[model samples]
Target: MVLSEGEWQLVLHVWAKVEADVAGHGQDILIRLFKSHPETLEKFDRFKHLKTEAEMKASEDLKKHGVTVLTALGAILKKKGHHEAELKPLAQSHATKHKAPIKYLEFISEAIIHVLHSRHPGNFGADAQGAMNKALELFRKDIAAKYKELGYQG
Candidate 1:
């Protein structure tokens, strides 16, 4: 699904808002993913042992990792072109090392959408959410492309 010019603007607008609290917002997204899909935690050695919400929240490792994820996402949003090459290593590691499924990427997208809508209740309207979803669809697709090359059937 391609985004129109207006849709691209909508996604970037809300994404800029998210940039205001990058680490905090990204942490929330990761937490939501782990909570919704506990199985995902197994892949993250830094977080798999974290059982309590407080533990997860307090983890410096978790916070740093979340920031890394957000930084990559910011680059994806800013440089819509030529992002797939940057994402290749990330996708390869997730597929070959972490053995993560494509569904995990979807879970991250869902977590992002959930956090954005709730955090910016006034700003993230239906159209904004749709735009953001479309943008992340591109993100996931690029990662999935690498996974495909690496022989990840799913």
Candidate 2:
């Protein structure tokens, strides 16, 4: 990862802000995604029945799903690729079972980038954003390597 230690600190600094929100930044990102792309909502059977934000929040499974992804991301950032072996199973499932593209991961980070910019009063800085983009690119490529192993071409 081209992300520097300083950049990672900035990333975590923003995460601190994200973590403080009562409903969590994970929920916010997914809610925005669902609003803008109902097609994504259709992809998850657990969420297909949810007609409203309240309904979605009410579903414990959906909320847990959001939390799980956030937790995974936290672990990913903290470990800095140290947990690749551990993360591989989950990555494989998302690729084969979920058939989810790596773009979904980037989608959430883009939302986070926007949130960091809008919510942070001062300069979020190009360094921080570039670091995040770099981290995300590394993450995507790391997981994409799995797809390549599975004879998947994308």
Candidate 3:
């Protein structure tokens, strides 16, 4: 997908805000996903003890993990060619270790937009949301293709 100059600016504007509070907002996004898709949390043994979003939000483990995940995502948003550099490794790990389904990834994409809007309100407008969605769609597509290429048939 082609991200226009305006789109790039819009995405990074929101991303910069997200990066600034990566631990906080990322925690919200993860909690949002876990609440919406309960099974997603099952993939992580570390989160197994947390039953509620509130629990997960408060867990120090969750906070650290959220930072790591969102930091990885932030890398994707920064600089040209970075996501591509990170793409294959991300795909390999999720496919091989995390065993994350595409729907979970879809949930994440939506969760990101949701978190941004709730946190930024009028700042993260439609154009910004759309750009972020487009970027995530590309990310999902790339990961899916690599997942397939890596032969996830074991």
Candidate 4:
């Protein structure tokens, strides 16, 4: 929640670039995550059986879920990391109800960073990379800490 001004600028740069196609980029991010971490598929009952990128790409459920995640990210970005309390309910659900692994949350951060850097190399220099990495690290840690508070073993 305490990012420097430069961190805000870099994250906003990437956010602006992807804003035009939030849905598309969101799907791409999820696909990237699913492909890299196949175990994550279990997190989505609808997408769990999707063995190929093509199948996942064609999934309506996948599309909606992707946008949901990205929209949540936008909310956090709008607050410049002051969105911790806003995420409490989601944290509770993901933790106690969904039994989500903390690793998946970290993987999501990696997925977004991968998607952004690959799509816009010029805007993702070392500084921007560091900034985004730091920001998303905070995101994962925040959610994970909340998970712990909710008595989640995972």
- Each candidate structure's TM-score, on Cα atoms with residue i matched to residue i, is 0.93, 0.81, 0.93, 0.93
Per-residue error at 56 for model 2, in Å? 2.9
Clashes of each: 0, 0, 0, 0
Clashing pairs in 4: none
Across 118-137, the per-residue lDDT of candidate 2 in tens digits comes to: 66646467876777677767
Give the poorly placed runs of model 4, Cα more than 4 Å off: none
Residue pairs clashing, model 1 = none
lDDT of 1 by residue, 85-151 (tens): 6787888878888888888889988999999988997889998888888888888887777788889
Query: Candidate 3 — worst ten consecutive residues by lDDT sum?
Result: 76-85
Q: Candidate 2: minimum summed lDDT over ten consecutive residues — where?
A: 17-26
TM-score of 2: 0.81
Q: Rate the local accuracy (lDDT) of all candidates.
A: 0.85, 0.71, 0.82, 0.86
Give residue 4's error in model 3 in angstroms. 1.1
Regions more than 4 Å wrong, model 3:
80-82
lDDT of 3: 0.82
The residue pairs that clash in candidate 2, if any, are none
lDDT of 3 by residue, 1-154 (tens): 6777788788888787777778898789889888988888789998978987678867998899889999888787775334766888888888899898788899888888889999987668887888888888877877788888987632
